[PDB]
């Protein structure tokens, strides 16, 4: 996978793309009007897509009778229905934000992120034969935004479309740097015109993350060494140690 430094750098890139800061925002909650209800915390776990529910489940297992427990029935219905409704989540956004610095709530988010995003990104990276930290970091950021579902905008759909366009994966012998450049092209195209129309407007404004990641490749920093300087017209300027 990614070593301690590389993983932190990958996460700080993802944090810039999600929140305009290298400080991971565990307390973030916002309705984006992208069909996902509330988008929350370090991964942008959402109330429509099932993963905010998982965070609250994991937190409730560790800390019974916490301030978010009462939202479980509505969160469960929202996940079942893939619903954008936030009208029956009064107080949820403020309660989530109030736990931004809570050790157990942060740990619950880290656990769900590891299970849903980091481990699947590293597993699919292994399946594709990716050897570079930068490629693995791109996969990690990609699964966070796109999810690991079965739909045409999903992480694995992007991998398969890249493999087709590139003539194979790096495991098959395709040069990993060329493959990653094609992957970034495929991801850009998906963000500009996703199959999921609800997210088209939001995702079109996120394409700058592809250029930030490509700029690391163009510096030939495939080991994701630090410091990294992000120089983005969209997000601004950042340093990542």
Ligand X SMILES: N[C@@H]1[C@@H](O)[C@H](O[C@@H]2O[C@H](CO)[C@@H](O[C@@H]3O[C@H](CO)[C@@H](O[C@@H]4O[C@H](CO)[C@@H](O[C@@H]5O[C@H](CO)[C@@H](O[C@@H]6O[C@H](CO)[C@@H](O)[C@H](O)[C@H]6N)[C@H](O)[C@H]5N)[C@H](O)[C@H]4N)[C@H](O)[C@H]3N)[C@H](O)[C@H]2N)[C@@H](CO)O[C@H]1O
- Minimum CB distance to ligand X, residue 121 (Å): 10
Task: State the pairing for strand pair 236-240/228-232.
Answer: antiparallel
Backbone φ and ψ of 39, nearest 5°: -105, 130
Q: CB-wise, 106 or 176, nearer to ligand X? A: 106
Q: Match 């736990």 to its residue by tokens.
A: 99
- Give the Å distances, CA to CA, from 124 to 1, 88, 131, 214, 220: 11, 37, 12, 20, 23
- Minimum CB distance to ligand X, residue 33 (Å): 11
Q: How many residues does the chain have?
A: 241
Coil/strand/helix, residue 216:
helix
Residues in contact with ligand X by CB under 6 A are 18-20, 32, 34, 39, 43-46, 49, 51, 116, 144-150, 199, 202-203, 205-206, 234-235
**Nearest-10 Cα torsion for 80, 82, 87, 91:** 70
- Which H or E run contains 57? helix 51-62
Q: CB-wise, 11 or 74, nearer to ligand X? A: 11
Q: CB-wise, 18 or 166, nearer to ligand X? A: 18
- Minimum CB distance to ligand X, residue 80 (Å): 13
Q: CB-wise, 71 or 155, nearer to ligand X? A: 155
Residue nearest to ligand X (CB): 147
**Nearest-10 Cα torsion for 29, 31, 37, 38:** 0
- Minimum CB distance to ligand X, residue 15 (Å): 9
Q: CB-wise, 19 or 86, nearer to ligand X? A: 19
- Minimum CB distance to ligand X, residue 16 (Å): 8
């Amino acid at each position: 996978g990614l070593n301690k430094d590389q993983k932190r750098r990958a996460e700080q890139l993802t944090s810039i793309f999600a929140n305009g800061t290298t400080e991971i925002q565990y307390g973030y909650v916002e309705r984006l009007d992208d069909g996902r209800g509330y988008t929350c915390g370090r991964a942008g776990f959402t109330t429509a897509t099932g993963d905010a529910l998982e965070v609250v489940e994991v937190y409730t297992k560790a800390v019974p009778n916490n301030k978010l427990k009462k939202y479980l029935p509505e969160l469960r219905r929202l996940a079942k229905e893939e619903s954008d409704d936030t009208s029956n989540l009064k107080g949820f956004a403020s309660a989530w934000k109030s736990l931004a610095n809570d050790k157990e709530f942060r740990a619950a988010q880290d656990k769900v992120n590891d299970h849903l995003y980091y481990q699947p990104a590293m597993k699919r990276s292994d399946n594709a034969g990716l050897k570079t930290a930068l490629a693995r970091a791109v996969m990690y950021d990609t699964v966070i935004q796109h999810g690991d579902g079965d739909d045409p905008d999903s992480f694995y759909a992007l991998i398969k479309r890249t493999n087709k366009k590139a003539g194979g994966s790096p495991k098959d012998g395709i040069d990993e740097k060329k493959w990653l450049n094609k992957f970034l092209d495929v991801r850009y195209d998906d963000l500009m015109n996703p199959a999921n129309h609800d997210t088209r407007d939001e995702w079109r404004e996120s394409v700058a993350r592809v250029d930030v990641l490509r700029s690391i490749a163009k510096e030939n920093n495939y080991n994701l060494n630090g410091p990294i300087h992000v120089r983005s017209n969209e997000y601004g300027n950042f340093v990542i140690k």
